[model samples]
Target: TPAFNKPKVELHVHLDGAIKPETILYFGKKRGIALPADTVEELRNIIGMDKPLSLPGFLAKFDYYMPVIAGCREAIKRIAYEFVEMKAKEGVVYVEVRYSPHLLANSKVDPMPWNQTEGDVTPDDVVDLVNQGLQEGEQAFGIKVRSILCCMRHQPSWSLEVLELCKKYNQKTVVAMDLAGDETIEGSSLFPGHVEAYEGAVKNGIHRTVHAGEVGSPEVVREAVDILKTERVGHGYHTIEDEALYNRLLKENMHFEVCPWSSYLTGAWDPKTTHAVVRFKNDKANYSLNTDDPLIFKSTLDTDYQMTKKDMGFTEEEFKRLNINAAKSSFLPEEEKKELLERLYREYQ
Candidate 1:
């Protein structure tokens, strides 16, 4: 086994988009919801590439898969169960999975209500189902998984309601709040309500993170940090474009949840260069690696580490530092982080 095979901590991932194509097809068949494609490769073509796009266009691709996944709690549970199994196999000890229940619910209707139509599930129902499935996943895998309720940036006001729901279920399984969806069209400033919602969640003791500088400019990253008060930023690749913002991020010691494959698929960076990781590592930027959407990008944490190492030419010591950075920047308590890091060092040695 490679050193990268050591236990890893992941802070960024999307639950709905992380389902394997076979799993989706399995559930689609079980639910009698005809999937657009029978094969995994075909399904990937349907989901389309995740390049830079407006929020509406980005959401349109997700709608194509909705029919196959609608009103299927068992499917979601199976996906969650398999995600942990895959993670454990790859040596991921802890992970934070975030997804917008609102978006998932957008496809969750009782199709039978309208003479067997499509699209009828409410947001609240999806949350409940996902929570149940997540509970089952945790019990079976014994892998620590935390759900972060996300509000799409396109519908900023709607996130407050999701935030409240996360609050209600905070003790159950939900651990944090996040701003998700395309950052290009729906800029960070468009979500003032969500920023306030994050503040409220923080005051209530919930952790906070936001998607920033992903498909947009560095200014979006700045807004997510200053306005949303986000402790961790997902795909802050554009921060390198703004010297001032990059310096500020360095000054604040903020953690960037860098997802190389996601960034590459989304055209935030060149896949050949894995520019974000290379730039961050060369600059000694405070950051950690992750797989934003394993299913969507066809990747895992181990892939992330390998791609990063290959692109950045990281030495063994640098690789260990990257792992240490992840543990240090984790949302875990000081004592817990200390224990994990101590254990990691001992194992690595």
Candidate 2:
């Protein structure tokens, strides 16, 4: 059952992590790739997580199936189109799906991804394919969708290119650039490539978000804010650890992309302690609920909603309030953002 059961907005899902299990099966077969499992259920069992794992361990789930889709143009577009449909069924009116474009491209990338031989699909091509697919799905499903390109924390070399892609595709489906992947690496945040990219984003007026304070310390979150000038923080559950920092961010109204179940599954949150979002609610912080990675997490938007509703004691008014906040903090142009806020208010009543 849907927890919110109303029009909603999701800001922090990963496009590559939300593909259907059946789609992976189809792609693996058509591309002659050897998958560990032949059936959807078997594949799901292999990729889906039930117990909490380290952030890096959770990321390993992608390696199991990325080989079947990366560098495949048809698979790329199909997955993007299907992503919109899946969110629509979950009652999402708008969503910003994110991914590392270089991970999906075999050509012009520093290191080959998914162990694939060099091919024609470039990172730029991947964005174009996703845009076409997202646009087609928007027309068919009647939902607004946007994309965010991600820079892997381990590969700072790819960051500048990510910013360029965001510039080229800004508002043409792409709304922001994000820093994702393992956040545990020491001092990766200050690497020249990532720093330059974020600086460029600031100069270019491109929006920014960073995967900080998930498994990393509050200081990592500090760097993301002071150096990267990120407009939002992804999985920022640990921001509460620094009372001074958390208070300042609240005053600044920095948007936090919070993923409830994903935080638990990724072991980013301690199940023993009160969840950070509860503090967010108590303090009236700016934040939004997200699924993060539905495929591997084996969740829907409702999984997070239900977890918050059932476990965290979220109420209907808070649901409506956060969706409104999500809209206000979205990277959509001012006019379109206003339009979305208007629609949400109309539906909420």
Candidate 3:
């Protein structure tokens, strides 16, 4: 347990979705933006993971604070800086943060005061700020950090711009690509035209991961693996309900970014009602434990590990496997990813 107690690696963390409540308050006040809650506890109660769990319940929390986060370039960088710093403090060696620019880029109606990358901002401006903040965070925290820009299902055109940004600036901080959104069954089907953008990403050296099969059917998972062609799957819990798709992904060696708390918070599975992790493990599939939104779920990667151990009866050895998978599944340069795996093995060896 001591070896597992120290933070290791995280592959599925959200940027705006993971920002601290205290930061939410600070950013809201500094930018002259108003949030519904006046205190951290209040904010936690409003947005923190809880009952009436559903996809919509989980997503509305993001709407509550998106304005403050996208308030300006400074705000975005500050959030990014603090995100890496916080993860580093908790002993995380590597982490990848993902978010969509459209959430931050279009906010003329936002209550925040006028500023750079605030009102009607461009993806270039916000992404550049994010890139700078991640670099700064690495330097300050000694954490190897990267970003995955989310392409919402509704905005297939946005994926092209995201790929262009990754191609332009990925030499520094950004890494890989992903399709992230709330739609389950309808999500993938809605983005038929966007497949070209992902193909473009592949041509340009970026890898693809999609948030598939959470609330959707395994056919969505099939589409993600078949038509959409994802290198990784996010919260593919529904795959457990469909062996055909599950075995397909398993045989393909696809990586699943399973978020324990998020699954419960988003109404996918309660640790009681289902043990998807156990099913995934018993299938001899490749998977990793993650915190989809640490802040929203009111938990951390370390906490996720502990919860898995205590509640799921997972052993220390199982935790090690999970950590190894996170490192191995990382979208870092092949050389860097190998080095990370070597380091991880050394730590647990």
Winning candidate number (lDDT): 2
Task: Write down the TM-score of every candidate.
Answer: 0.87, 0.99, 0.92
Tell me the lDDT of model 3 at 284: 63
- lDDT of each residue in 1-349, candidate 2, tens digit only: 6789999999999999999999999999999998889999999999999999899999999999999999999999999999999999999999999999999999999789988899999999999999999999999999999999999999999999999999999999899999998899998888999999999999999999999999998888999999999999997888888999989999999999999999999999999999999999988888999999999999999999999999988999999999999999999999999999999999999
Candidate 1: tens digits of C-alpha lDDT, residues 1-349: 3537666778888887777787777777777776678888998877756455343454566665655664555565566677777777767777777877765554543223213345556667777777777677777877667678887776776777878888787746677788887666645555577877878877877778888888778888888888778888988888888998898888888888888767766677755554866778887877777888677666667777777666668667776776688778776657867888888788788
**Candidate achieving higher TM-score, 1 or 2:** 2
Candidate number with greatest TM-score: 2
Angstrom error at residue 43, model 3: 1.8
Order by TM-score, highest first: 2, 3, 1
**CA-lDDT, candidates in order:** 0.73, 0.95, 0.78
Model 2 root-mean-square deviation: 0.6
Candidate 2: clashing pairs of residues: none
* Rank order (by lDDT, best first): 2, 3, 1
Off by over 4 Å in 2: none
Candidates' RMSD to native = 3.6, 0.6, 3.0
TM-score of candidate 3 against the unseen true structure: 0.92
